[PDB]
Amino acid sequence: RKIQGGSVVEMQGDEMTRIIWELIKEKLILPYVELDLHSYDLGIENRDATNDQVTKDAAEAIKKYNVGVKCATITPDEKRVEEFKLKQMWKSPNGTIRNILGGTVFREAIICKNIPRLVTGWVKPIIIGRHAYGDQYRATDFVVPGPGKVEITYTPKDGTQKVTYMVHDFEEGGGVAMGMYNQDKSIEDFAHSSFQMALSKGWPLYLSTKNTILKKYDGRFKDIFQEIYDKKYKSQFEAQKICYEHRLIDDMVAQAMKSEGGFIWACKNYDGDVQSDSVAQGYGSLGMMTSVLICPDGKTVEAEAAHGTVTRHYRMYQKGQETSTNPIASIFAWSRGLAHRAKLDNNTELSFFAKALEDVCIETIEAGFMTKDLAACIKGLPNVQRSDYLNTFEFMDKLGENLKAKLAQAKL
Amino acid sequence: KIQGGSVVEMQGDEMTRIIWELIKEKLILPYVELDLHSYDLGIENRDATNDQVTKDAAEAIKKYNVGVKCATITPDEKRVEEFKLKQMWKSPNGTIRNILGGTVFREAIICKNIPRLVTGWVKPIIIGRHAYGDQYRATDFVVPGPGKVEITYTPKDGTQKVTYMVHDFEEGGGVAMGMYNQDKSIEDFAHSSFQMALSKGWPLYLSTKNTILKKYDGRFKDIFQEIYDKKYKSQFEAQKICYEHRLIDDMVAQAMKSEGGFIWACKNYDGDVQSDSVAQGYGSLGMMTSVLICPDGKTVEAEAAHGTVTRHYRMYQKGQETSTNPIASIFAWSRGLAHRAKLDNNTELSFFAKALEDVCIETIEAGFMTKDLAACIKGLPNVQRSDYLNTFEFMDKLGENLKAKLAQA
Ligand SMILES: NC(=O)c1ccc[n+]([C@@H]2O[C@H](COP(=O)([O-])OP(=O)(O)OC[C@H]3O[C@@H](n4cnc5c(N)ncnc54)[C@H](OP(=O)(O)O)[C@@H]3O)[C@@H](O)[C@H]2O)c1
Ligand SMILES: NC(=O)c1ccc[n+]([C@@H]2O[C@H](COP(=O)([O-])OP(=O)(O)OC[C@H]3O[C@@H](n4cnc5c(N)ncnc54)[C@H](OP(=O)(O)O)[C@@H]3O)[C@@H](O)[C@H]2O)c1
């Protein structure tokens, strides 16, 4: 009989990842695990259909059952509005889910011994702790239509002084403007998650900001981290002989590039987004990275691929060009989500299944069966033959065969 | 000595200040006579003049069209205490760029014997960094407690004011900020980017986060596309190159895995961050050029992209030997003087500028380099003192080779 897995919130997505997502459920999950699957279609059409209510409903469900596994989703701009005949330019479902749940998105490469990196020195893992709240991802932006002043105003609840700051006086023509923000409590949760992750790994921690330029905004991050360190984690850090350091983002990305890895990197929301993809590509592929939102309650997680819907491959798929999209990141959303589900329930069999799922992925790749992106890592793109890799369906089938075999052995 | 002409010089801070004088003393003035308009943008003098020296320097560049700037300290609270400053002064770079406008073009300085950290970059990556607006001319503040932050637009013509909610802080405080950009600046940004692509013969990529900042970043995307479809597309096809917008996180990955050989138009912030990422990728922050090209097509400001290298300066203060790479600071002068030459049809200064650059590359390729470059070759753990020269040892070697090169031609 199948493993009794419990309640998991599933969020279906878009385009190429939507296709892969179904193959994963059919070939790797459902045959072995029976889940109370709370499914929410976060495909762009359904979101438009529900006026994005389905996205909010999914986030609330994650609060209830403590485990979310999410497929990559289209975040629409004008072109997407035209493409799907949308009612509105809906906000990022990820931004909405993260805004509701809070926490830190931890991202890390998935490493195979036979895959060369683009960055020579990274023999140890780099873990990015991405602050999941605020800044650009909950901003209020608009087009400035012509000459006029933009100002930003603070009005305290407590009737004290109201303050108006000049943003810019557009003397001729227009442009754009935006306001963005963050909250002390969220920054504090972010700091705590960062120090704790470093202590659990036994690695140094770095925070990057641009506090020289955003003296107040980014200065707040810097101050809160330092304060929380001096009060809560300093002695613990000293005991494990690791350090915490603040660096300017400029300096930090250069430092990361030349390091050997083996550190925790606390990033502001935007930096965490951009640099996690830089790092993932650095180790080999966007297809080879885990991403898990760890919420402040220490119980709730949302696992996801860090990459998008892989539109370009999807276009190929729509035109019958054979595709070779890497499913590993999407598979690890399931394994990481199921592993947490297992941990909460002390579900030994589910834990075993989740690790076995990950082992199958690594073993299969290390045995020389891989998608084109990984084959490109080994051979270099110009040297890649069709014989060097498997197409998307072939690779999924190969994983399914290897998983079946591995789970069959273990039972014997 | 060569008669250079009028150049605006800006002195800086810490390690780069030292190097800056070494450069002038050995590599420039011994060969070039300059109408040198010097401004001390050191932290001490900026404080002394209430940062007026920085604005004066900017106006000077506009007048004489050539500026060469040394790296400067941008003060935060720690700098305020360290130097007992009157105020937390704004970045002199931000101030200068805000006045001059333009695009900061950044690119690695390549030596054949220096291994990269990124295996695939056999061709160069040129970043065009929009030098105006966004985070670098923003208004930020601490939110002291519960309350609402709103952003408002008041039309100049007296029509209806518009107010947007930024955030209602219901519990505790936080931070907030407003930032902006201008259509004309974005347009100049676009033009400078397409033109650079065409002059280099390479494809052009613009990165934004327009899926998230739909209005703000969408404007950048729309302005680039419009200008492309109307002035540069035909030329692009004719050179068999192309323009493409990408989301920033896609772009950084694409860049990481590419062979190089493209122009990368970045918003101010991305240009800042990714230029350091790329410089380090090719080998060293010390090995990158940075040139602000102003929208008038005649004014230029050259600089090092890296900072004042405070950590090396700290060792220097404690008497320890330092090995800081001067090449970027040297190229600030060479790029500045080279532009000065093009302006004045000065064929003898153009030669000197090129000669200064060739001497740097020749010397490094001959096995004489600072510790950072030696670490590229051997690996940091395997570097020994015999593998490199200290800052002053290296500057002297450059001094000799320069003179010989000039003599021979
Ligand atoms: N977490 C999320 O829900 C999320 C995150 C990012 C983007 N998105 C959305 O996804 C859509 C497409 O965005 P995008 O094209 O900028 O980024 P993307 O979907 O991540 O893909 C961009 C490029 O990255 C490479 N790539 C990403 N995942 C890959 C994989 N699994 N296997 C092999 N290669 C992979 C491919 O490179 P090559 O083309 O060179 O082969 C692909 O064309 C957009 O609508 C965006 O809003 C969603
Ligand atoms: N253009 C500018 O005026 C500008 C730009 C950036 C920063 N800054 C200012 O500079 C100060 C220090 O900033 P920061 O320490 O974050 O950055 P930084 O001075 O650029 O460099 C920090 C690290 O980068 C490496 N590095 C940079 N330039 C180098 C060179 N020429 N040769 C060898 N190594 C080099 C060193 O690495 P290792 O320690 O590993 O040896 C150094 O410790 C700050 O006050 C900042 O405001 C100014």
Numbering used by the authors:
A (entry chain A): 3 to 414
B (entry chain B): 4 to 412
Paper text:
Isocitrate dehydrogenase (IDH) catalyses oxidative decarboxylation of isocitrate to α-ketoglutarate. NADP+-dependent IDHs are mainly located in mitochondria and cytoplasm, and play an essential role in cellular defences against oxidative damage as a source of NADPH. To investigate the effects of Cd2+ on IDH, we determined crystal structures of mcIDH alone and in the presence of 20 mM CdCl2 at 2.0 and 2.5 Å resolution, respectively. The structure consists of a homodimer in which each subunit comprises a large N-terminal Rossmann fold domain and a small C-terminal domain and β-hairpin clasp.
The native IDH structure without Cd2+ does not have strong density for the cation, but it does include density corresponding to two water molecules that are hydrogen bonded at the position of the cation. One water molecule interacts with D275, D279, and R109, while the other water molecule bridges A308 and D252 of the other subunit. In the crystal structure, the cofactor NADP+ is found at the crevice between large and small subunits. NADP+ remained bound to the protein after protein purification.
